[PDB]
Design a protein around this ligand. Structure first.
Ligand code: NAG
Ligand code: NAG
Ligand code: NAG
Lengths: 99, 372, 119, 79, 372, 79, 372, 79, 119
């Protein structure tokens, strides 16, 4: 199992998350509105899925992954989540902030 | 095993019929049958009962409209709307002679200009066959049109007739299985000290009236994800005990076919579900996914990798792709058959041998030494 | 494109509960299905994955042995079975879909739905 | 329930896929296709007009196709 | 026996010429030759004397009529029949590039668009050959158009030229004979105790200037009921004593070619007149008519059935058809050659052997055991 | 009198058919085909009419065929 | 050596994608991406990122102009020039179905109608590759169009899509060399007393990431006077010491491959510069020029003749033409290798052997006699 | 300076030509081509004129191509 | 189409002389080059010939060993080198082209030019 630490918990907004092992680029970023379904922002930590603007961006590395926002928008509030999907099926989400 | 099958005439049932239209007083019978009727069953002078069509009636235009005009020395066509209409009608007839001018008489596959889909279905519907053979070829027109020949028959007595030869399927709904062979080989550090063999009877097997057919050519067979659509012109029959060879190699009921050599190459075989990767010597054999890269590394010897989660098998420098059907694979954990034989004495040079035949050669050579 | 699930209510710890999750729109027989639960205000955590074919299953390490997941393709529904429920399972579940087709490896979730509540 | 299934034998290193269906071509069925065409001797009419020029051009092209195909019938098919 | 023939360049007599048009000052020589003359003999800078044509004169239309109009900023074509006429003329030039865009430059066979039939007869009529070779190609245009290559030469200096490579027949009217071989095999109830062999020197034989040619490929030859129309690129010459092998197999003047194996299959060979049916093991070999069903049932061993009254030969499950030519067949009632050899000691594995070579192997093995 | 005749030998089980005639391709004969085409720079004239539109469309097709054939000459034939 | 290469699926990376367009809710994604945009990058449900185009927009004509008219029971088209325009636009769609009706779904090579030249250049320019592979592909369109597959994918939801599969060249600018082999034989007056062997490792050799590839099929490779344009799907890799076999045949680092027979034929091999003429027995082997006739007469045994001043090599009755490239040839004056072996004891029957393997057979057979 | 060069070995009677360049096809690249076509139910309008007859004839030919291609999709490609 | 050569003048016997012969028009890298000299009023006689590629050379038997001929394809020029000229070399030289392309055998002359004079 891989425990995942995401900081700063409960804080332009930039969030950094680390991992206990070396996962190459297997990071997904989730955005959950308060009381709504957690729509998925981006896959493989760099590619943005359809339905989100170009404000979001991602930086990946062997050890740590960083999400950056170009600028805050009124409809850009809620908690954020991270996921790793390494070789084995075990998936770990981890903590989440409150933007 | 491509040489063991018999050689036969491709189209000898079409040329035989065309040789009947050439005798005097025959083509008039066909014309009389097609009197104010497109499709009608006719009986030839040979004794067969062929089915005839009257495609592309062109006399009703040129003879009725354009002939009285151009023979009056002061011809005058009314409007351009007639010329364009006439050019379309006179386009099918040009393509027929254009396609016959390069193949010298015999055409394969029959093109759309010759027997279009609108008339092929009308020709199938009135063939003298059962209610299942019609169903099979009605929904697979693009295959029965790839195994059909057309032959220039006659142009005599002011009429053009060319015979179209269509396939007729006799055996339907019997299980065909196909086996893929790989050259299993023993592994040693010192090159030249390793002997090995490989099975040769690869291809398609399935039953035909209490026996089993066998097509050695793996490329002369089609696939519709359930059917084979092959032909018996290039197939050699075998006794129905050939199925026991796959599970019991050392059975005495029926000996299998093998070939032997003293060389090994890292070559793969792409099966229906997965690849039989076989890397030998000093090579890097790998099976990788399309989203995660390397996920498996094989060792020396035969190995099997399924297509569930594996999308690319790489051996050495080549990069084979794997088919993506859906079927339940299986693995029978056995032990290699090569370890029984002694590498000291071995018939290393064979091209068409058998398990028994190779056994006899070792039995003779090993016992001959044991005299004194 | 949406998929709905049922099975809400309250049960005393010690009673089993099997909740289904219907699906419409997308081709059900080519996708894998996940189950993730979330306590009100807390973080999401993953529980079990059923493969598209149905011969592969991977329960969460924290909760294993008392869980059972089943998949049917004829009625294109997925059913999750529990037994011996303990009071830290009182949360909101989520029956979600994957984003890759016909693979035995799993890559996150893509389509969610209105989850069910237990206890 | 299941169509395709494949087994792999480690002993002989030769897989086999079962579950297909057959369609074997046993014999042929002869069918005759008849095309009716009208022969023309020669077009005696001339003219500097454009519409008639196209008709005479196509009729000549029609005659060539019949004439070309006339000599192709003499040789027997090779198969 | 296809590997013993030498490999040679398919079309190296056309690429050599096309490499000559590329040098500076050569294309202008061709243009001057075709000054108000369609067909004219020209001499290249290589030293050869090629023949040239001027097909599809297209400058006389676009440059004279359509060019002054479209360059005036207020173009206005008068009538629609001019557009339709122009589309027909430009149609041929489009088809040439379409057919050249997928073959990468070399085309075979030459299509009707490339060298039309109305001009190929004019190109043949002026070749520097005798009066009998011309007649051969004049009545067989559909064959000489199947053994010809066309190549991109040059498009430089505002002209398009492509070399057409036509075959030239040097040897005419010498008797070609062809032999068909079947694997005669001994018959025994116990499988695996039967040895047998088959001749491999099958194909087309005929004389060439005091010798005999031999094409081992049975598919690269045509038939016009009297001619063969093959080529010498894939043939190997032999001494003129090969004809003695057919009648005197055990002659010492020239040894024949055989191959040996310890397996047998009921396979037929469709000859020009009848089938050499050879059924072994446990199979039902039959020859049937199309109006009376079964008329003959063969026993184990080689057998011959004529085409006079037999229209279908069936072996096992396959149903071969029989050619329907007309000629006098004959039967030489001899005795099988296999009964001489002893099945105990035999060179079971051969792929390219001879009567002498197999005899030596038996002679060595039988005499060696006679020491003690 | 007779063209085709076939012999069958029981001893070697190999039939032979005699009486054909030969036609062997010994050498080739080169022949050059010349096609004359007129180049065009660019059609500067416009128009909303239909008859002119067809001519400009076809002339564009003619120019493209020459353009695509221009780069095909550079590579030598493969044979 | 054609059987030693592995067999793989030709087009299995296109059928996999075509099976992805079929699941529900996918073809709408492609349609939405191509909204007022011809070429765009789309990501499928398989995780791949294909590139899509919107060729032949036809809804803008029929739905806008011809649809409101023909549904009014009193239709009336204004002028004839509207019909002629519509026939040209509708012509391309007819040709596509004609090409699919005989190939049963898979077409190769891709014709101009399917993916035109004016578009294939725009499709190459946006492929995620380097700036050198693009240059190689852009100047050799007529070759990359001969190695491309197209598959009929889907016509569902009122839109037609067919996947075009293009090659991707990975290894560029590494030196490829090719060797030609001839069957050198010893010359004796008495026939049957002469043996010989010939090398079978003919084909294309060149490096691939620290190793050497080997294509045994000499016909499935192109030439542009500098490039080979081969494919790795039908090639077997070898250790990098194969080049030492050419200069040192008897080296122990890597054994070469030979085949042996006791028959000799006068067969030539046309190389890139000259011919390896090898005349044996009693034949007249000659090399002649096109302006002076006979200029050289070879003797028995292997011989080499350059293409400088020689334009025709004749052996027996055949007449091979010689390629006319420009390169510096060379002659290494060695001694024939067959003279070492003793004709008395010799493994005359081999099809896949080696220098060591033949050496072992002679070593065992010669020493076995030496007992007593 | 020199591209092609060939050496001949008298000992083994096997010449080798050196100096070419490689272009090896490692992998494939999928690219989807989309063609947009508009369906039509059936043309109810008639007429004895000529220009309209051509449009109805061609639209019928367009419909048959779509119908023929409709049944060609069910079968899985054979490669 | 024409080709021009230089190198005129008078030199005492014992002085070397290298005269060039440029070429324009025809593709020079595919043809052989000949040198022939003619005394005023006398007959033509043959001098060395250089092959098209440049490893084969044949000098006249009467004058051999003291002659040198060079060919360059980059500047498409041909240069003839002489040493120890003797009084019977006073003549008019001619730098002429052949009439066959890419052949190692020589067949006459086709294109001549205004030659130079020596001594
Ligand atoms: C030869 O084979 C038979 C049966 O396969 C066996 O009984 C016999 O022992 C073998 N010969 C020797 C010398 O072992
Ligand atoms: C070997 O062959 C020769 C002639 O073919 C024959 O005379 C001799 O008897 C044979 N050897 C034996 C041992 O019979
Ligand atoms: C067998 O070969 C080895 C090395 O190749 C050699 O030393 C030996 O002498 C050979 N055997 C005989 C009997 O000469």
């Amino acid at each position: 199992d891989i425990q995942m630490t995401q900081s700063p918990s409960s804080l332009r907004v930039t969030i950094t998350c680390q991992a206990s092992q070396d996962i190459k680029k297997y990071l997904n970023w989730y955005h959950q509105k308060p009381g709504k379904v957690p729509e998925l922002l981006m896959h493989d930590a760099s590619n943005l899925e359809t339905g989100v603007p170009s404000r979001f961006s991602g930086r990946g590395s062997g050890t740590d992954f960083t999400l950056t926002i170009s600028s805050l928008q009124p409809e850009d509030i809620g908690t954020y989540y991270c996921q790793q999907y390494d070789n084995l099926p075990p998936l770990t989400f981890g903590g989440g902030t409150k933007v | 095993l491509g040489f063991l099958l018999g050689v036969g005439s491709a189209c000898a049932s079409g040329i035989a019929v065309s040789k009947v239209l050439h005798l005097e007083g025959e083509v008039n019978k066909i014309k009389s049958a097609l009197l104010s009727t497109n499709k009608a069953v006719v009986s030839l002078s040979n004794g067969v009962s062929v089915l005839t069509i009257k495609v592309l009636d062109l006399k009703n235009y040129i003879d009725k409209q354009l002939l009285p005009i151009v023979n009056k020395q002061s011809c005058s066509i009314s409007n351009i709307e007639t010329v364009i209409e006439f050019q379309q009608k006179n386009n099918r007839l040009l393509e027929i002679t254009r396609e016959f001018s390069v193949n010298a008489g015999v055409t394969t596959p029959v093109s759309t200009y010759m027997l279009t889909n609108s008339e092929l279905l009308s020709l199938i519907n009135d063939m003298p066959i059962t209610n299942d053979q019609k169903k099979l070829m009605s929904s697979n027109v693009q295959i029965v049109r790839q195994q059909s020949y057309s032959i220039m028959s006659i142009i005599k007595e002011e009429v053009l007739a060319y015979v179209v030869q269509l396939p007729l399927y006799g055996v339907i709904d019997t299980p065909c299985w196909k086996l893929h062979t790989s050259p299993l080989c023993t592994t040693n550090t010192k090159e030249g000290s390793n002997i090995c063999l490989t099975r040769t009877d690869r291809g398609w097997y399935c039953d035909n009236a209490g026996s089993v057919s066998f097509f050695p050519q793996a490329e002369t067979c089609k696939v519709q994800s359930n059917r084979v659509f092959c032909d018996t012109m290039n197939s050699l029959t075998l006794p129905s005990e050939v199925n026991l060879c796959n599970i019991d190699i050392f059975n005495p009921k029926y000996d299998c076919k093998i070939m032997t050599s003293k060389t090994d190459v890292s070559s793969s075989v792409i099966t229906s579900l997965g690849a039989i990767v076989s890397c030998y010597g000093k090579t890097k054999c790998t099976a990788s996914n399309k989203n995660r890269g390397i996920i498996k590394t094989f060792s020396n010897g035969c190995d099997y990798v399924s297509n569930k989660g594996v999308d690319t098998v790489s051996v050495g420098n080549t990069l084979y792709y794997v088919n993506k059907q859906e079927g339940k694979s299986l693995y029978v954990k056995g032990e290699p058959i090569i370890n029984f034989y002694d590498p000291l004495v071995f018939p290393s040079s064979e091209f068409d041998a058998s398990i028994s035949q190779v056994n006899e050669k070792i039995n003779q050579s090993l016992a001959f030494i044991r005299k004194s | 494109v949406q998929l709905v699930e049922s099975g809400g209510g309250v049960v005393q710890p010690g009673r089993s509960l099997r909740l289904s999750c219907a699906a419409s729109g997308f081709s059900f027989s080519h996708y894998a299905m996940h189950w993730v639960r979330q306590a009100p205000g807390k973080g999401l955590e993953w529980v079990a994955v059923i493969s598209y074919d149905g011969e592969n299953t991977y329960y969460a390490d924290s909760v294993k042995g008392r869980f059972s997941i089943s998949r049917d393709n004829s009625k294109n529904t997925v059913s999750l079975q529990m037994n011996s429920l303990r009071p830290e399972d009182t949360a909101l579940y989520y029956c979600a879909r994957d984003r890759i087709v016909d693979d035995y490896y799993y890559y996150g979730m893509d389509v969610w739905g209105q989850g069910a509540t237990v206890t | 329930s299941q169509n395709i299934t494949e087994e792999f034998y480690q002993s002989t290193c030769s897989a086999v896929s079962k579950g297909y269906l057959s369609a074997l071509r046993t014999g042929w069925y002869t069918s005759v296709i008849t095309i009716e065409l009208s022969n023309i001797k020669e077009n005696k009419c001339n003219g500097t007009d454009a519409k008639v020029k196209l008709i005479k051009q196509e009729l000549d092209k029609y005659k060539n196709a019949v004439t070309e195909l006339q000599l192709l019938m003499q040789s027997t098919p090779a198969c």
